[PDB]
Design an enzyme around this catalytic site. Structure first.
Site, PDB file in Angstrom:
ATOM      1  N   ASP A  43      26.611  39.545  42.989  1.00  0.00           N
ATOM      2  CA  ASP A  43      26.765  40.880  42.450  1.00  0.00           C
ATOM      3  C   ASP A  43      25.412  41.565  42.389  1.00  0.00           C
ATOM      4  O   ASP A  43      24.480  41.053  41.778  1.00  0.00           O
ATOM      5  CB  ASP A  43      27.415  40.804  41.068  1.00  0.00           C
ATOM      6  CG  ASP A  43      27.861  42.163  40.532  1.00  0.00           C
ATOM      7  OD1 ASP A  43      27.346  43.203  40.978  1.00  0.00           O
ATOM      8  OD2 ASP A  43      28.723  42.281  39.633  1.00  0.00           O
ATOM      9  N   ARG A  51      41.569  42.728  49.969  1.00  0.00           N
ATOM     10  CA  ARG A  51      40.325  43.433  49.719  1.00  0.00           C
ATOM     11  C   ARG A  51      39.155  42.801  50.471  1.00  0.00           C
ATOM     12  O   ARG A  51      39.234  42.666  51.696  1.00  0.00           O
ATOM     13  CB  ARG A  51      40.097  43.540  48.214  1.00  0.00           C
ATOM     14  CG  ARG A  51      41.186  44.376  47.503  1.00  0.00           C
ATOM     15  CD  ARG A  51      41.301  44.172  45.981  1.00  0.00           C
ATOM     16  NE  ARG A  51      40.017  44.265  45.285  1.00  0.00           N
ATOM     17  CZ  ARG A  51      39.388  45.398  45.006  1.00  0.00           C
ATOM     18  NH1 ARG A  51      39.917  46.555  45.347  1.00  0.00           N
ATOM     19  NH2 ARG A  51      38.224  45.371  44.374  1.00  0.00           N
ATOM     20  N   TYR A  65      31.338  36.674  32.961  1.00  0.00           N
ATOM     21  CA  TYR A  65      31.292  37.035  34.376  1.00  0.00           C
ATOM     22  C   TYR A  65      29.854  37.150  34.880  1.00  0.00           C
ATOM     23  O   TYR A  65      29.517  36.580  35.919  1.00  0.00           O
ATOM     24  CB  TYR A  65      32.079  38.316  34.672  1.00  0.00           C
ATOM     25  CG  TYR A  65      31.724  38.920  36.009  1.00  0.00           C
ATOM     26  CD1 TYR A  65      32.418  38.570  37.171  1.00  0.00           C
ATOM     27  CD2 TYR A  65      30.668  39.828  36.121  1.00  0.00           C
ATOM     28  CE1 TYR A  65      32.076  39.122  38.409  1.00  0.00           C
ATOM     29  CE2 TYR A  65      30.323  40.379  37.337  1.00  0.00           C
ATOM     30  CZ  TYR A  65      31.032  40.023  38.476  1.00  0.00           C
ATOM     31  OH  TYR A  65      30.682  40.568  39.674  1.00  0.00           O
TER      32      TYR A  65
HETATM   33  N1  LIG Z   1      34.891  44.869  44.272  1.00  0.00           N
HETATM   34  C1  LIG Z   1      33.632  45.092  43.932  1.00  0.00           C
HETATM   35  O1  LIG Z   1      33.156  46.390  43.847  1.00  0.00           O
HETATM   36  C2  LIG Z   1      32.698  43.961  43.648  1.00  0.00           C
HETATM   37  C3  LIG Z   1      31.464  44.231  43.039  1.00  0.00           C
HETATM   38  C4  LIG Z   1      30.514  43.221  42.887  1.00  0.00           C
HETATM   39  C5  LIG Z   1      30.825  41.948  43.364  1.00  0.00           C
HETATM   40  N2  LIG Z   1      32.029  41.694  43.978  1.00  0.00           N
HETATM   41  C6  LIG Z   1      32.282  40.334  44.464  1.00  0.00           C
HETATM   42  O2  LIG Z   1      32.817  40.306  45.772  1.00  0.00           O
HETATM   43  C7  LIG Z   1      33.864  39.368  45.854  1.00  0.00           C
HETATM   44  C8  LIG Z   1      35.171  40.028  46.323  1.00  0.00           C
HETATM   45  O3  LIG Z   1      35.457  41.207  45.604  1.00  0.00           O
HETATM   46  P1  LIG Z   1      36.965  41.713  45.388  1.00  0.00           P
HETATM   47  O4  LIG Z   1      36.985  42.958  44.568  1.00  0.00           O
HETATM   48  O5  LIG Z   1      37.677  41.753  46.689  1.00  0.00           O
HETATM   49  O6  LIG Z   1      37.599  40.507  44.533  1.00  0.00           O
HETATM   50  P2  LIG Z   1      39.011  40.644  43.765  1.00  0.00           P
HETATM   51  O7  LIG Z   1      39.916  41.675  44.320  1.00  0.00           O
HETATM   52  O8  LIG Z   1      38.801  40.980  42.349  1.00  0.00           O
HETATM   53  O9  LIG Z   1      39.629  39.180  43.863  1.00  0.00           O
HETATM   54  C9  LIG Z   1      39.140  38.207  44.731  1.00  0.00           C
HETATM   55  C10 LIG Z   1      40.126  37.051  44.780  1.00  0.00           C
HETATM   56  O10 LIG Z   1      39.695  35.981  43.962  1.00  0.00           O
HETATM   57  C11 LIG Z   1      40.823  35.175  43.729  1.00  0.00           C
HETATM   58  N3  LIG Z   1      40.716  34.480  42.446  1.00  0.00           N
HETATM   59  C12 LIG Z   1      40.399  35.018  41.232  1.00  0.00           C
HETATM   60  N4  LIG Z   1      40.420  34.027  40.315  1.00  0.00           N
HETATM   61  C13 LIG Z   1      40.740  32.859  40.929  1.00  0.00           C
HETATM   62  C14 LIG Z   1      40.898  31.549  40.473  1.00  0.00           C
HETATM   63  N5  LIG Z   1      40.644  31.220  39.217  1.00  0.00           N
HETATM   64  N6  LIG Z   1      41.242  30.560  41.365  1.00  0.00           N
HETATM   65  C15 LIG Z   1      41.428  30.869  42.695  1.00  0.00           C
HETATM   66  N7  LIG Z   1      41.284  32.170  43.129  1.00  0.00           N
HETATM   67  C16 LIG Z   1      40.938  33.144  42.268  1.00  0.00           C
HETATM   68  C17 LIG Z   1      42.054  36.064  43.748  1.00  0.00           C
HETATM   69  O11 LIG Z   1      42.986  35.463  44.616  1.00  0.00           O
HETATM   70  P3  LIG Z   1      44.578  35.648  44.452  1.00  0.00           P
HETATM   71  O12 LIG Z   1      44.897  37.125  44.405  1.00  0.00           O
HETATM   72  O13 LIG Z   1      45.217  34.970  45.643  1.00  0.00           O
HETATM   73  O14 LIG Z   1      45.092  34.978  43.205  1.00  0.00           O
HETATM   74  C18 LIG Z   1      41.527  37.385  44.273  1.00  0.00           C
HETATM   75  O15 LIG Z   1      42.318  37.916  45.304  1.00  0.00           O
HETATM   76  C19 LIG Z   1      33.983  38.729  44.480  1.00  0.00           C
HETATM   77  O16 LIG Z   1      33.292  37.497  44.449  1.00  0.00           O
HETATM   78  C20 LIG Z   1      33.299  39.697  43.554  1.00  0.00           C
HETATM   79  O17 LIG Z   1      32.670  39.065  42.460  1.00  0.00           O
HETATM   80  C21 LIG Z   1      32.969  42.679  44.126  1.00  0.00           C
HETATM   81  N1  LIG Z   2      34.838  47.058  40.453  1.00  0.00           N
HETATM   82  C1  LIG Z   2      35.234  45.787  40.639  1.00  0.00           C
HETATM   83  C2  LIG Z   2      36.568  45.496  40.978  1.00  0.00           C
HETATM   84  C3  LIG Z   2      36.989  44.173  41.179  1.00  0.00           C
HETATM   85  C4  LIG Z   2      36.061  43.124  41.036  1.00  0.00           C
HETATM   86  N2  LIG Z   2      36.428  41.839  41.218  1.00  0.00           N
HETATM   87  C5  LIG Z   2      35.544  40.825  41.084  1.00  0.00           C
HETATM   88  N3  LIG Z   2      35.934  39.565  41.271  1.00  0.00           N
HETATM   89  N4  LIG Z   2      34.264  41.069  40.763  1.00  0.00           N
HETATM   90  C6  LIG Z   2      33.843  42.330  40.563  1.00  0.00           C
HETATM   91  N5  LIG Z   2      32.583  42.547  40.253  1.00  0.00           N
HETATM   92  C7  LIG Z   2      34.727  43.400  40.690  1.00  0.00           C
HETATM   93  C8  LIG Z   2      34.317  44.726  40.502  1.00  0.00           C
END
Ligand SMILES: NC(=O)c1ccc[n+]([C@@H]2O[C@H](COP(=O)([O-])OP(=O)(O)OC[C@H]3O[C@@H](n4cnc5c(N)ncnc54)[C@H](OP(=O)(O)O)[C@@H]3O)[C@@H](O)[C@H]2O)c1
Ligand SMILES: Nc1ccc2nc(N)nc(N)c2c1
Ligand SMILES: NC(=O)c1ccc[n+]([C@@H]2O[C@H](COP(=O)([O-])OP(=O)(O)OC[C@H]3O[C@@H](n4cnc5c(N)ncnc54)[C@H](OP(=O)(O)O)[C@@H]3O)[C@@H](O)[C@H]2O)c1
Ligand SMILES: NC(=O)c1ccc[n+]([C@@H]2O[C@H](COP(=O)([O-])OP(=O)(O)OC[C@H]3O[C@@H](n4cnc5c(N)ncnc54)[C@H](OP(=O)(O)O)[C@@H]3O)[C@@H](O)[C@H]2O)c1
Ligand SMILES: NC(=O)c1ccc[n+]([C@@H]2O[C@H](COP(=O)([O-])OP(=O)(O)OC[C@H]3O[C@@H](n4cnc5c(N)ncnc54)[C@H](OP(=O)(O)O)[C@@H]3O)[C@@H](O)[C@H]2O)c1
Ligand SMILES: Nc1ccc2nc(N)nc(N)c2c1
Ligand SMILES: Nc1ccc2nc(N)nc(N)c2c1
Ligand SMILES: Nc1ccc2nc(N)nc(N)c2c1
Ligand SMILES: Nc1ccc2nc(N)nc(N)c2c1
Lengths: 256, 264, 276, 274
Positions: free
Chosen positions: B166, B13, B179
């Site tokens: 975020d 992602r 979170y």
């Molecule tokens: N997706 C969104 O719409 C969204 C919205 C707001 C903010 N964000 C921020 O943007 C960043 C990336 O988003 P994302 O959706 O791609 O993240 P994600 O899919 O939820 O996961 C990010 C990665 O973090 C790793 N992780 C989680 N817990 C961990 C731990 N305790 N120790 C080591 N690694 C850990 C996991 O690695 P492994 O799979 O290898 O275990 C996972 O692949 C995050 O910081 C998130 O807070 C995302």
């Molecule tokens: N919608 C969405 C999906 C995955 C996500 N993962 C992390 N780590 N943080 C989020 N805010 C998040 C949001």
């Protein structure tokens, strides 16, 4: 009817002032402390002398550590703080997360850095969260018929954390966490009419930067901060929730 | 020589997109992961196929807990600080440098204040605060010591730290308190680290997505009425890392399609 | 081939923004009020590098009516809204498009709340109109005109990267003593950035802010006091270069930033993190 | 012995509540109005009935336009906004010899969309919305400050306070209300700037920002219920008092270390998202 307040770090300075202020408005006060046993008991005696059965004291390390009797987790200790109010007075209407450790964690020049992390994050952020959770469960678990009518949680934040003090990163991070909690808790606890606000001092009761405070060129007094806390707890402030009020004499408006 | 980036949570992602983005600008990439071993190694093979020795993968739990030593098993010796130091070290061991750090790894799941089991609160607290706030701090510390420990004549010229924050944490998602708290901590770290590391010319910035790569929620986003793509977020990270952004530090950039401007 | 309108484009940050956009392939409408020589000189440079890639238009962006002429006489007078509509029009008349708008023009000078604790109803009635015009009111009308020309284009013949950038100020939460109207104006500009982003999202027009801290500082002062002011910026202990700001503007205008809208990006070397 | 408050847009709703609240704490109140003469004089009578000589009502257009000077077909003519503002503050000094509190509450609020002889409604919208919400507060504050500065330290009051009615929701703008939103943004700036510049005179400058208060019900009952229920706390708009009590607290000496801050009074509405 007597309303009840739990004030962490209540023994001296701002926590004292908050405790006194709330007491002056008719609250029964649960004065929490960690090390300051003498000052806490001394204060409780004062409040109890003016009004019988209006003050108790309980002791707790709010650091994110388990202790010893299962050692006991921080969540358990926090639950028992809130419970102490219910056991003694049958209620808890106001919570003030005031207790806070504050000392340098520089990024530039490893055991005492284990405990810095648990202390500064525990007191300033983690414990507040567990305290809030305990507070919220008790309220939720009371039948609507006998619930109080002015539930209020105040978080002592920091007006200056957007302009961080050099070398105080964990502390600043912890206050950032606390601001998050204020917003999150306000939103989740709105249905139970529990208000969650922050109060952020700039400089208060010091012992330098005295002259750089635009309004009055001095740090505040304890009352100058606690009066705001007390106002936010009053039913006059019953529509305020999720906000942080700077009590800083315009210090946050300055620049180098 | 080649600039080096460490990217936590790099396997899929957004972290993958960041890794790819940085690699496309010529960076060697240290891809961190926790359990996504397959997807991390698969990505490393892709990058290494495009450019030899331009990717490694490193494994670490970034939760605020202890792990076991050598041939043992957990709640014993190896602290989070140690693991974090060893992540940064892995870059120096392999490539002799670490120019960019991206704190991207992040656990995300509900911690309701209202019920409406015993370790649940312990391990959630350690995981959510570890990944999102504590580990980032130790990673930044390790990063900074290495830079400080390099003789000036031999330091890089574009040191950059990006913290995935975020855009929506001021308008909290119901039930996600720890979170939200953790992201609040991360924002503080951004400001604090920017100020303390300025003398070493290490820049510290935040990037905050709104909705990205969703598995109508979309329809709520004012711009385009959709969540973003991974690239729509990583391109910002990559820009902030570029030398064209060398005067930016201590700021958080929302990448949210105007979602934060909405109300119920 | 994409077209940019940049107000206050003759010098300093506006010049850099214009140059930066031009380097990415934009045709540039260079706006000026007072700096005719410096604007035409710049246009000549850009046109020499690439034929028909720069024009110059003149306009007072102060919130005043200015009548039919710059010499003759009268008929009905010219409002700020009219002037602003004609700026945007100048892009459409010359190149048939306007893809990017940069509200950069801005007056900046003291309006003290107190005297000592001369002045007139003139310097006063014109400070208000100039500071609020350049910094806030004109930007609003410029944005209106921009949005009307986009909305008025049939969907088939619309551009694919519409972007508005508002030059804000990273330091306005820590106001400079005596500059109230200016600060107020930037406050207004920030509001416009949010409000316009929300209203123009359906037309895929992005609206963002960029806020400098200290950039290309003028040394009309002792060298030590100049050194004094420079060194309170934490990153590098200097004000920025023009490019250090313009590269941010240009990035926000790129399609790579096409999910960013309604945000302000400080470019300030961490100056906003400081305290007295 | 009697502290004096100037409250703009004082005739009803929030301004009235602020006026009443300040009067209840012992303030003499100069009630400002533009169009609501009846409502303002009615309120003044109430306050004066409760306490003699504790209320006057002054009239002024706070739009950014020049008016004409009671006339006489002679005598230059154009009365600027700055003059009218100075005369508001003066009215307090003329009548009671003081002005301790200013509340910038008057505010016009109506749509100025960017999409879709009325050049007339563009010029006048700009002057009105920017005048009431931002420009006039600035001049008011200037007059206020000049008058405090001009008093010898010896006779000065001990609790000088300026409150600016802002908006808790302006970071999440209401669609089509751009000038209004810009104006509130200006007002926020003024709060910060004025706090900083007037600190030496011990004049405090703070903002109070409502979310939804005394929500006008000119819509289907259910549309009103709908909007209503968007507020997390209580699922209703506030009452006037729920806002004015905050204003009054910030004016009290118990808040005398607070300056340059804006306090949301919004029931957590700003914490919501679409
Ligand atoms: N997706 C969104 O719409 C969204 C919205 C707001 C903010 N964000 C921020 O943007 C960043 C990336 O988003 P994302 O959706 O791609 O993240 P994600 O899919 O939820 O996961 C990010 C990665 O973090 C790793 N992780 C989680 N817990 C961990 C731990 N305790 N120790 C080591 N690694 C850990 C996991 O690695 P492994 O799979 O290898 O275990 C996972 O692949 C995050 O910081 C998130 O807070 C995302
Ligand atoms: N919608 C969405 C999906 C995955 C996500 N993962 C992390 N780590 N943080 C989020 N805010 C998040 C949001
Ligand atoms: N003082 C200021 O200018 C200032 C500025 C900004 C913000 N604040 C905030 O305002 C609040 C109060 O200020 P203050 O100066 O009065 O606080 P303080 O004097 O520094 O101490 C507050 C109390 O916190 C308790 N405490 C610290 N660590 C603890 C731990 N790990 N477990 C349990 N208790 C712990 C201590 O209790 P014991 O003595 O009993 O051990 C202490 O008395 C704090 O939250 C602070 O962050 C203050
Ligand atoms: N420089 C900084 O450190 C700094 C700091 C914070 C924010 N900013 C913001 O960044 C932007 C550019 O900065 P800058 O220093 O390059 O600006 P600048 O040198 O002060 O001047 C910008 C241009 O604005 C034009 N202008 C001013 N008033 C005008 C009016 N009433 N009508 C029409 N045009 C008018 C002028 O054009 P003419 O010369 O042709 O008359 C001027 O060249 C501004 O918005 C500023 O507020 C700059
Ligand atoms: N009501 C809300 O939910 C809400 C929400 C957010 C913020 N606020 C802020 O809180 C304050 C009070 O709210 P409200 O609803 O009570 O206000 P309101 O009913 O809309 O009216 C306030 C008063 O402002 C005066 N006014 C408007 N334009 C004027 C002008 N050009 N010159 C002189 N006076 C003018 C009017 O006086 P006359 O009738 O005498 O002409 C009016 O009674 C305002 O500043 C508002 O922006 C209110
Ligand atoms: N100046 C000062 C003194 C004591 C303090 N204690 C805590 N907990 N937090 C502060 N910010 C603080 C500041
Ligand atoms: N309508 C009108 C008539 C005569 C005029 N003369 C001058 N000099 N200027 C005017 N604007 C004007 C307007
Ligand atoms: N330092 C400085 C110099 C010139 C400026 N011009 C404008 N328009 N705005 C500023 N903030 C500025 C600052
Ligand atoms: N809902 C509502 C009603 C009246 C109002 N009046 C002013 N002046 N400002 C508002 N924001 C407002 C809002």
């Amino acid at each position: 009817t007597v309303p009840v307040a739990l004030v962490t770090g209540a023994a001296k300075r701002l926590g004292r002032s908050i405790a006194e202020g709330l007491h002056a408005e008719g609250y029964a006060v649960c004065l929490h402390y960690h090390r300051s046993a003498a000052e806490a008991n001394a204060l409780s005696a004062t409040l109890n002398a003016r009004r019988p059965n209006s003050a108790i004291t309980v002791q707790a390390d709010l650091s994110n550590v388990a202790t010893a009797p299962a050692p006991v987790t921080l969540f358990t200790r926090c639950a028992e703080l809130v419970a102490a109010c219910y056991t003694h007075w049958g209620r808890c209407d106001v919570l003030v997360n005031n207790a806070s450790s504050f000392y340098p964690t520089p990024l530039l020049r490893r055991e005492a850095m284990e405990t810095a992390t648990a202390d500064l994050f525990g007191s300033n952020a983690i414990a507040p969260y567990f305290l809030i959770k305990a507070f919220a469960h008790r309220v939720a678990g009371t039948p609507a018929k006998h619930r109080g009518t002015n539930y209020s949680i105040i978080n002592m934040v920091d007006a200056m954390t957007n302009q961080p003090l050099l070398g105080y990163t964990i502390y600043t991070m912890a206050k950032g966490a606390l601001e998050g909690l204020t917003r999150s808790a306000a939103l989740e606890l709105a249905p139970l009419q529990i208000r969650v606000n922050g109060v952020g001092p700039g400089l208060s009761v010091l012992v330098g930067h005295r002259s750089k405070v635009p309004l009055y060129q001095r740090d505040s007094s304890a009352a100058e901060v606690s009066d705001v806390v007390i106002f936010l707890c009053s039913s006059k402030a019953k529509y305020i929730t999720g906000t942080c009020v700077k009590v800083d004499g315009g210090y946050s408006l300055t620049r180098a």
